[PDB]
Amino acid sequence: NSFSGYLKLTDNVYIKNADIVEEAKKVKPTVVVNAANVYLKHGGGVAGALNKATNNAMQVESDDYIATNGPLKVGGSCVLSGHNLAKHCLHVVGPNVNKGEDIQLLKSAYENFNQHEVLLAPLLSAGIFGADPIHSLRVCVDTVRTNVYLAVFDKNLYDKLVSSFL
């Protein structure tokens, strides 16, 4: 958990313009959050980047979790191995508003972070899930009470977030 170059937005939310995969390799946090779908199929976005950094070990593991426990629900999560990136990976499903999923579930998605004292995470439901990233940051700030280090890859998005917040 040796985080560096973060900007403290609130008492418990910090932000940095960085690739979460690189942050994970440097810090080796206790928990790295994945922006997952209900079947834990890591095909693109941050899920694909995280899976690729474990050389498909996250996917083999996820396929075994799904065969044994069934799919997650939108707003839910599960804790799996973090492999070479972290001690644990917390897979969290935010709503896919581009597929008509309810934005009210984005609060439920963020409540999962509260079971862990410190997490390295991306913005939920942003990118391919189609929700407004600035709105996503607002729900994170209002919902998460534990210590969360948000890593934002796109510098244009990072600058919009820091401008809207501070």
Ligand X SMILES: O=C(O)[C@@H]1CCC[C@H]1c1ccc2ncsc2c1
The smaller minimum CB distance to ligand X, of residues 75 and 122, is found at 122
DSSP string covering 82-117: -TTT-SEEEEE----GGGT--TTHHHHHHHGGGGSS
Q: 94 with 123: CB under 8 angstroms?
A: no
The smaller minimum CB distance to ligand X, of residues 67 and 166, is found at 166
Query: Which positions touch ligand X (CB under 6 A)?
Result: 19-21, 35, 45-46, 49, 122-123, 126-127, 152-154, 157
Beta bridge partners of 149: 14, 120
The smaller minimum CB distance to ligand X, of residues 46 and 109, is found at 46
Closest distance of CB 19 from ligand X, Å: 4
Beta bridge partners of 31: 88
Closest distance of CB 149 from ligand X, Å: 13
Backbone breaks in the chain (C–N > 2.5 Å) follow which residues?
none
Beta strand 147-152 with 88-92 is: unpaired
The smaller minimum CB distance to ligand X, of residues 64 and 132, is found at 132
Closest distance of CB 29 from ligand X, Å: 15
Closest distance of CB 153 from ligand X, Å: 4
